[PDB]
Amino acid sequence: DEDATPCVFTDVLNQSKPVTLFLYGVVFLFGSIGNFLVIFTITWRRRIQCSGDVYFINLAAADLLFVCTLPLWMQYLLDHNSLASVPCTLLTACFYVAMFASLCFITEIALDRYYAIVYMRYRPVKQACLFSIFWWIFAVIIAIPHFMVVTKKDNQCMTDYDYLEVSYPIILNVELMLGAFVIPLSVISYCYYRISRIVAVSQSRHKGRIVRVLIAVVLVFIIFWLPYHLTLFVDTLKLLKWISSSCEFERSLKRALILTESLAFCHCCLNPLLYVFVGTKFRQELHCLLAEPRGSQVQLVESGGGLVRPGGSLRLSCAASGSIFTIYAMGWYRQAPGKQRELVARITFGGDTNYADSVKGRFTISRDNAKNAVYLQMNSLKPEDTAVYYCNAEETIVEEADYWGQGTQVTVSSRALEVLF
Amino acid sequence: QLQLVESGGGLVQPGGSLRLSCAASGYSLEYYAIGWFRQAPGKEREGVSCISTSVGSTKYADSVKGRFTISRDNAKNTVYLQMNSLKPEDTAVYYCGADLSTFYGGNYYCGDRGIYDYYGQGTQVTV
Amino acid sequence: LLPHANYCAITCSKMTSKIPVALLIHYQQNQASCGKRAIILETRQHRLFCADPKEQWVKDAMQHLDRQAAALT
Ligand SMILES: CC(C)CCC[C@@H](C)[C@H]1CC[C@H]2[C@@H]3CC=C4C[C@@H](O)CC[C@]4(C)[C@H]3CC[C@]12C
Ligand SMILES: CC(C)CCC[C@@H](C)[C@H]1CC[C@H]2[C@@H]3CC=C4C[C@@H](O)CC[C@]4(C)[C@H]3CC[C@]12C
Ligand SMILES: CCCCCCCC/C=C/CCCCCCCC(=O)OC[C@H](O)CO
Ligand SMILES: CCCCCCCC/C=C/CCCCCCCC(=O)OC[C@H](O)CO
Ligand SMILES: CCCCCCCC/C=C\CCCCCCCC(=O)OC[C@H](O)CO
Ligand SMILES: [Zn+2]
């Protein structure tokens, strides 16, 4: 009579369940905290300045929707009766919408930084918000066939395989393997390879850390997602009858699927450390909110200062002497003798401008991307504007703003001159 | 704001010695390059001395190099120009101004033809 | 929860060719399982076997067992 008998998993599930519940609590703890600090850092007492900030918040929002479902799933593991047939599908919906959106914006980070570095295509804040809407819509419509089929059958929320064809779980794995891993990893790898190959030869004073940051993004993505997709590959090979599979093999593969699944959930906790909190600007900003023998590289040469009577006009000019391709925004700062440094005019390469309250309406800031030049027309000058105007430049990915000029003097008054000879 | 006040004068024949005391009123002048310039009745302006924020920089005129001596002091926010061995050419109304020209970095190096902005009422040195 | 990593206790790899109607004692519909609908046939030998539900010989074996399994009826 003998043939293949049912392969039982009662002990594998009993040993894997405590690990999954533990990791779920860990992912929920750090994932919700880490992604809240991201949104809090880029919104609290500050406007969104670049296109990267838009995608960072949207990335943190997708991770938030994911981690907020884990305490619901924890109640599901502790007792299967707790989840009905209608919240499961809806709760499963938030898993795939948030999962695909997380991968969509991760891909958009590389693309946004790809077109900016090599193709000199900069996106204003207004456009980044529009693309985020498109990605969220695209993430929902592409997840429909992934959660709409999951129902509650035999008191377990499961993929209803009886109402589908036998080819469906094979196609579902192949689509998930290439759609969620191959394609995202190929884009972010090609983009960051092209970017790294350009920055490594530029004269940027952070070219070293820029490459290390971009490599970490790729490495972390692999070391957290590959074990899950590599287990689906050998699971798909099992369903495809390409390899043999005994009962013991299916038990080892089952535990691997459970363990590697909890490993992949940790990746949404690392996204704040991979994009946002790796830049010094976000490090200094978070501190101010949490409440606790030769020249080097590219120097900013300034010119266009001088003296003018009250009501005149001047044109300050600033440009980068070296060849650097990672600057995304520049601005002007000033410091009167004995006073602190204040912002007067900042413009990004996308077009979004930002002026101070006292200056708005008199000075007009403009830039040139092809020459990395920024000009400040200072019309209707007042005696209170007398200070030393410094030029500042900000850098992408590394989020550094340690590019400063020597400082030019601008004096607006009824001065007196005395030639010394 | 910052306004300068000079309080050094008097009437001394050639050979006398006065002290030109320029005090700052409103802002401690640790941060400006302050220099002295004079103007005799009927003549154009001309600078005689200059001192900066940096410790080593100093400037004097061609006809007074060595005869005068300028020095900064944070006591009462006052620089001093000691006039020694006066000449009839020194008969002029001296003014104390702050130079706002040639700021290389950190400190205002004293410069030729430096624009002055905050200067006092003036003192009369009759020789 | 990602696919194939759900908590199912029973998985069937192959179905039985034929079970004689006089050797089975009980069939239990899968309380929980990963794959398609699978009926667990318990023989007189107290050994479990997987069976496909959409079969002519399995359908009648489910009518014979269910009728005789009714205690004292
Ligand atoms: C840098 C990356 C690869 C980190 C390494 C993660 C390790 C733990 C990953 C990489 C390849 C994965 C394996 C791929 C294939 C299978 C065969 C299956 O029958 C048991 C699980 C098993 C054995 C996976 C276990 C986890 C695994 C070994
Ligand atoms: C960052 C590091 C810790 C990740 C390491 C991955 C570890 C935790 C996971 C990934 C795949 C898992 C293995 C995959 C399959 C099996 C076969 C099973 O019969 C025994 C457990 C065992 C051997 C698992 C043990 C733990 C395992 C290796
Ligand atoms: C089962 C029924 C559904 C279950 C639902 C579970 C709870 C969902 C909570 C998600 C957190 C949302 C975090 C906040 C997201 C908004 C972030 C934000 O401020 O907006 C971004 C901005 O608009 C871009 O420009
Ligand atoms: C609660 C569990 C505790 C686990 C704690 C793990 C924290 C380590 C982070 C790993 C991934 C993020 C790595 C960030 C990669 C950045 C590398 C980088 O920027 O290099 C530094 C630079 O060269 C000089 O500043
Ligand atoms: C087997 C099934 C596998 C499924 C795998 C799915 C892979 C999805 C990838 C791309 C689709 C997204 C297309 C989005 C097109 C947007 C074009 C656009 O917005 O243009 C911007 C313009 O180029 C400014 O640079
Ligand atoms: Zn019988």
Numbering used by the authors:
A (entry chain A): 17 to 308, 997 to 1125
B (entry chain D): 1 to 127
C (entry chain B): 1 to 73
Question: What do the authors of the reporting publication say about this deposited model?
Answer:
Human cytomegalovirus (CMV) has ‘hijacked’ a relatively ligand-specific human GPCR, and repurposed it through evolution to serve as a highly cross-reactive ‘chemokine sink’ as a mechanism to subvert host immunity. US28 binds with high affinity to many CC-type chemokines, in addition to CX3CL1. US28 signals constitutively via the G protein Gq, and cells expressing US28 exhibit constitutive cell migration, which is thought to principally occur through β-arrestin signaling. Single chain fusions of US28 with intracellularly directed nanobodies (Nb7 or Nb11) enable purification of stable, apo-US28 that can be used to stain yeast cells displaying chemokine on their surface, thereby solving the general problem of structural instability of GPCRs purified in apo form.
We determined the crystal structure of the US28 fusion to nanobody in complex with the engineered chemokine CX3CL1.35 to 3.5 Å resolution. Crystallization of the CX3CL1.35 complex by Lipidic Cubic Phase required an additional nanobody, raised by alpaca immunization against apo-US28Nb7. CX3CL1.35 contacts a symmetry-related nanobody B1 raising the question of whether the native conformation of the complex enables lattice contacts or, conversely, whether lattice contacts induce a non-native conformational change in the complex. The chemokine globular body sits atop the receptor in a very similar disposition as wild type CX3CL1, albeit CX3CL1.35 is rotated by 16.8°, contributing to reduced interaction between the chemokine N-loop and US28 ECL2. Unlike the wild-type chemokine, CX3CL1.35 also projects into the major pocket of the receptor toward TM5 and TM6, contacting Asn1895.39, Leu1925.42, Tyr2446.51, Leu2486.55, and Asp2516.58. These residues superficially surround the Trp2416.48 rotamer switch that is implicated in the transition between inactive and active GPCR structures. CX3CL1.35 loses the extensive direct contacts to TM2 and ECL2 evident in the structure of the wild-type chemokine. Indirect contacts between CX3CL1.35 and US28 ECL2 are mediated by the sulfonate moiety of a MES ion from the crystallization buffer. Conversely, CX3CL1.35 distorts TM1, TM6, and TM7 away from the receptor core, resulting in an expanded binding pocket.
